[PDB]
Q: What sequence folds into this?
């Protein structure tokens, strides 16, 4: 299991640091950033993220995921197309710079487009009186936070398979606040007391390391 | 009051989309963005966000907040120091693109710094197997959304002043999930059942608009 990162930016460096313990390959055109990348844990391949052969060297084939963040949206698209020539199944997460380009990146085969300025402009509009929402968002997204957001899979044969929210009583049982459940394409926020859990559902919750290790055991 | 935005970027443009109906002034040096700024519904002010006279004419004094997003680290700082010469209390929210400048912006007097690449990089590391967390983050922030995050202040004289989270029972009474309570410089995420609501607290909840309305009702003050 391993992750490939295409491009080196403030976003990808923060990504790399949030992926401590994990084996990672960074592919980028600028040799300058080797020790930055090495010292930062991961492995470095010097090359062009838009060149199939350079993606192959970076071990795109068979990767857990590929994260793409090139200098411009047009470059990002070219790299995606490149990864798709190599591996039709590997998960691609691409960063979009401009709103008009999001669908272009998914069209090229990105499974997910993260738009930092969308998120940021939305937080700006929410911070006109106080910083509580941004505070929330920034914090639950950090693995090093005390209370953080986590995804927990309901495996096949869990005590919760076919069990409603009300009965699982997860918050009281575990302390983890359930914010959502991911099931195939969709996210159900605020699962109603009615909701029946299924194997393969992803439980999105917020809790201390303590409450999380607990939920896993309940689960 | 009105909000002022210094600079024009993909972030401020999305911010305008979310400040509809609110009165907004954008002050920016690139006259080429004037057309985009007005179509988005802001008043455009051509000028230099690091110059007090241009900040004043963009109505910084007494604004509800000023959003700063400039490409230069040094211009952001100067813009913040210029805002502070005009108005010492106005809320200033500044965008950082490098970690390394977040403390300079604070030292300069920004009340809040938003760093898009911190949030982006964390979502990237969170999306390695699936996109549910990103789906959560951008959904809840969208003000044009089906269930979204909101902040609701606890007003002076609230039915809930001095009431426990447990007694309050906001989720089942209103449907709003309480994610946190903001009090002073602190966010209390998932407040314990022994936590006692005080006036001035800000409730962070997720819910449908009809549910937010009930919460607004559940917390209004009783005064003639």
A:
């Amino acid at each position: 299991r391993h992750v490939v990162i295409c491009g080196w930016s403030e976003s990808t460096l923060e990504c790399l640091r949030e992926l401590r313990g994990s084996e990672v390959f960074v592919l980028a055109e600028d040799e300058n950033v080797r020790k930055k990348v090495l010292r930062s844990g991961a492995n470095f391949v010097h090359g062009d993220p838009t060149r199939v052969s350079d993606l192959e060297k970076a071990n795109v084939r068979g990767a857990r995921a590929v994260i793409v963040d090139l200098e411009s949206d047009s470059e990002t698209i070219h790299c995606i197309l490149g990864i798709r020539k190599i591996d039709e199944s590997v998960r691609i997460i691409a960063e979009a710079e401009r709103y008009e380009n999001i669908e272009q990146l998914r069209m090229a085969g990105a499974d997910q487009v993260i738009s930092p300025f969308v998120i940021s402009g939305r937080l700006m509009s929410r911070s006109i009186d106080d910083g509580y929402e941004a505070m929330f968002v920034q914090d639950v997204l950090a693995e090093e936070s005390t209370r953080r957001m986590v995804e927990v899979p309901i495996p096949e044969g869990s005590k919760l398979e076919g069990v409603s929210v009300l009965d699982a009583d997860i918050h009281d049982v575990t302390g983890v606040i359930i914010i959502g459940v991911g099931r195939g394409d969709e996210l159900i926020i605020d699962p109603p007391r009615d909701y029946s859990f299924r194997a393969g559902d992803i439980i999105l919750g917020i809790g201390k390391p303590e409450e999380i290790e607990r939920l896993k055991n309940y689960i």
About this structure: Residues 146-219 of chain A form a domain with the Alpha-Beta Plaits fold (CATH 3.30.70.1450). Chain A touches chain B through 68 residues (CB under 8 Å). The first helix of chain A runs from residue 10 to 18.
